Amino acid sequence: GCKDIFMKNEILSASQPFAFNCTFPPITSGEVSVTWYKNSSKIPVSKIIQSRIHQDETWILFLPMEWGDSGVYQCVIKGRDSCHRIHVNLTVFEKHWCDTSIGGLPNLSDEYKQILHLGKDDSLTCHLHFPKSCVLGPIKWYKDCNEIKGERFTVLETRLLVSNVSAEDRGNYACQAILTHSGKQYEVLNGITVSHH
């Protein structure tokens, strides 16, 4: 009698480290066990830590996600007397914008769009969702594929602070982080289309 929950939006990722957390409040806030499945209902994702795809606590983790990994993934949440099966579409693309326009981000979802409000002190955010086993280094920021340097621009943890947002602050951005996991380092690169709207 497992109740199926379907995620609204698909999740897009470059071919790089990627993770998705199995969550469903208020159920997962209780005492439940979580099991990830890759196009199956019978054989669970491995928990071998050296496996390219594996479950890490409540997360499914790809180190890295690769072509062929696109699909519907399922998370089965079992409580004492409750069962929920969460469906989510995970889609990988192969290329990054600064390398080529080919085979990259297939559509510009809300997760790849951000807004900088003109004449104000605004910010951009580098969205990095990973299990605690993945340690994120400092974040480098790029504007039209060139490293950002300027007094108006300040790196504060996960955000890029932009003071006195100008008309020319629109365009293509990218944030880059080093991910360290189990003694090995991986690069995470996320693109953003920024506008004033």
Partner: antibody, heavy 119, light 109 residues
Framework: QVQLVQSGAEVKKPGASVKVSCKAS????????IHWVKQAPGQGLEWMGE????????NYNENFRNKVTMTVDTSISTAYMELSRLRSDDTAVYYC????????????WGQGTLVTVSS | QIVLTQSPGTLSLSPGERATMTCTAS???????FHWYQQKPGQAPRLWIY???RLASGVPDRFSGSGSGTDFTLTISRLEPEDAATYYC?????????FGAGTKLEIKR
């Protein structure tokens, strides 16, 4: 509204070179990839390569590796496509297009430039 | 290179009839990277269908695209005269980008 305006037709002698321009407006020039497309008379469409005016990276169709050189002058929002050592089979209409992040297709085209190679 | 084989090369049909053209790819193309263009003589190609099945701006509902992996199809439900043109398929999946050789649609009257 995105616009691409190309330079006029030209004739050039065999062995010479030609440089076609593509002037852009209606968007942030450095936030895009410019592509060039070849249409030989009566034939279909052949992709030549792409240039990113932001980091000036170029990726050429290797069938045009030693033929084409893509450049930009960002101060006037203009992309250039240069063909070297012209032969007869370089006679064709050339199109520039522009591509945006998350939109991997060609919605905007220049009007085309006919380049004729002749003595 | 991903080669796109487009057929038929020429289509000759009367108004109201159904038009079908196919594109077969030598390697799998993702559905988000497969597109069709319409070109009339003397004019630049116009984006017509993108992402296998989405209509570009100004494109009437009688046009529809479908396909998967290696087999794609453009269908025109009920032909109008303004549909006369050459249609090209296109993949944005893998470098170098490639186009089909085209299907020229002629309208009988």
């Amino acid at each position: 509204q995105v616009q691409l305006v190309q330079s006029g037709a030209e004739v050039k002698k065999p062995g010479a070179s030609v440089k076609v321009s593509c002037k852009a407006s209606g968007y942030s020039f450095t936030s895009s990839w410019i592509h060039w497309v070849k249409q030989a008379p009566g034939q279909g469409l052949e992709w030549m390569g792409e240039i990113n005016p932001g980091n000036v990276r170029t990726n050429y169709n290797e069938n045009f590796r030693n033929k084409v050189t893509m450049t930009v002058d960002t101060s006037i929002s203009t992309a250039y496509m240069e063909l070297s050592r012209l032969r007869s089979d370089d006679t064709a209409v050339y199109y520039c297009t522009v591509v945006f992040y998350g939109e991997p297709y060609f919605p905007y085209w220049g009007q085309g430039t006919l380049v004729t190679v002749s003595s | 290179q991903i080669v796109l084989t487009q057929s038929p090369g020429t289509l000759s049909l009367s108004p109201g009839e159904r038009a079908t053209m196919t594109c077969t790819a030598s390697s799998s193309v993702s559905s988000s990277y497969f597109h069709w263009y319409q070109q009339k003589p003397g004019q630049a190609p116009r984006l017509w269908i993108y992402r296998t099945s989405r209509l570009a701006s100004g494109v009437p509902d009688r046009f529809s695209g479908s396909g998967s992996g290696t087999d794609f199809t453009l269908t025109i439900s009920r032909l109008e005269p303004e549909d006369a043109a050459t249609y090209y398929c296109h993949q944005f999946h893998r470098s170098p980008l490639t186009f089909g050789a085209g299907t020229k649609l002629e309208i009988k009257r």
